[PDB]
A = this chain, B = another copy of it.
Amino acid sequence: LAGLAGQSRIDASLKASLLRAVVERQRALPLVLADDAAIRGALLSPDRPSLDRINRKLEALATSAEAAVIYLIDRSGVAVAASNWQEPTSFVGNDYAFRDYFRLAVRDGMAEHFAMGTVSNRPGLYISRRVDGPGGPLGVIVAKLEFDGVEADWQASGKPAYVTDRRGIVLITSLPSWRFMTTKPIAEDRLAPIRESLQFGDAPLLPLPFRKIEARPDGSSTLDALLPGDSTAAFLRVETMVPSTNWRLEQLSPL
């Protein structure tokens, strides 16, 4: 068992590292596109030829980065150009002012917020960066980062895992029906903030269904957990911070 806590911990730490790496690959996009002269170019003078170029510029990057979408928003919250410009789900002509990833980036310069997609209903990290001219803001570049990939790996690791934020909400998980569950408690009067924050409303916000929790001296714990399709089993849980985020990552190893 203590010989299982050892191996669990390195798995954990490694999954957390692959996650770190994956978040940072995506952060490089808005980072480099905030300063990009053709972006700036387009916002200063948004003519059709110009915005078609950026449409294609971004189409290619969503595909080389592996963003679900990269898109560029007007001074006033309108998406003017978008990786998905040729698809019937083209964000172009959409209103993002009531964003959080929008208004926060407008206010602070950059933002990162895990939210459900208006039309999609698919979770992910909106990574955004304000675009500037000399002497004033011009708009916002957003790239949105989905975790189906790392969630798929873990699911094949044989040690399930989910990730919670500071508030305690599972954002990323290898078992989808644990998404938006809680790990703390949480406090009644911060619930709609949150539902709103998440762009969901009716998220569960109930505790993970872990039963029979036993804390261990070395900091592990055991619990019982009914995984889907399975009869109930006992697990070793270990935990680790995900570097350069404010997330904890939590892992189960079958006993």
A17 touches which of B18, B24, B37 (Cβ 8 Å): B18
Q: Can you name the residue of chain B whose Cβ is closest to the Cβ of A64? A: B31
Tell me which residues across on chain B come within 8 A of A15, comparing CB atoms. Answer: 14
How far is the CB of A120 from the nearest CB of chain B, in Å? 23
In the complex, A156 has a CB within 8 A of chain B: yes
B interface footprint on A11-41 (CB within 8 Å = 1, 0 otherwise): 1011101100110111111011101111001
What number of A residues sit within 8 Å (CB to CB) of B? 32
Q: Which of A11, A14, A29 gathers most chain B CB within 10 Å?
A: A14
CB of A191 closer than 8 Å to a CB of B: no
A21 (CB) vs chain B CBs: closest residue: B21
Determine if A196 is an interface residue (Cβ-Cβ < 8 Å): no
Instruction: Provide the main secondary structure of the chain A interface.
Output: helix
Kindly report which residue of chain B lies nearest to residue A6, judged by CB atoms: B158
B28 pairs with A32, CB closer than 8 A: yes
Proximity bits, A28-67, B CB within 8 Å = 1, else 0: 1101110111100100000000000000010001001110
Is A76 on the interface with B (CB-CB < 8 A)? no
10 contacts between A and B (CB under 8 A): A10-B156, A14-B14, A14-B15, A14-B18, A14-B157, A25-B25, A27-B64, A28-B65, A36-B38, A37-B41
Interface residues of A (CB under 8 A from B): 10-11, 13-15, 17-18, 21-22, 24-29, 31-33, 35-38, 41, 57, 61, 64-66, 153, 156-158
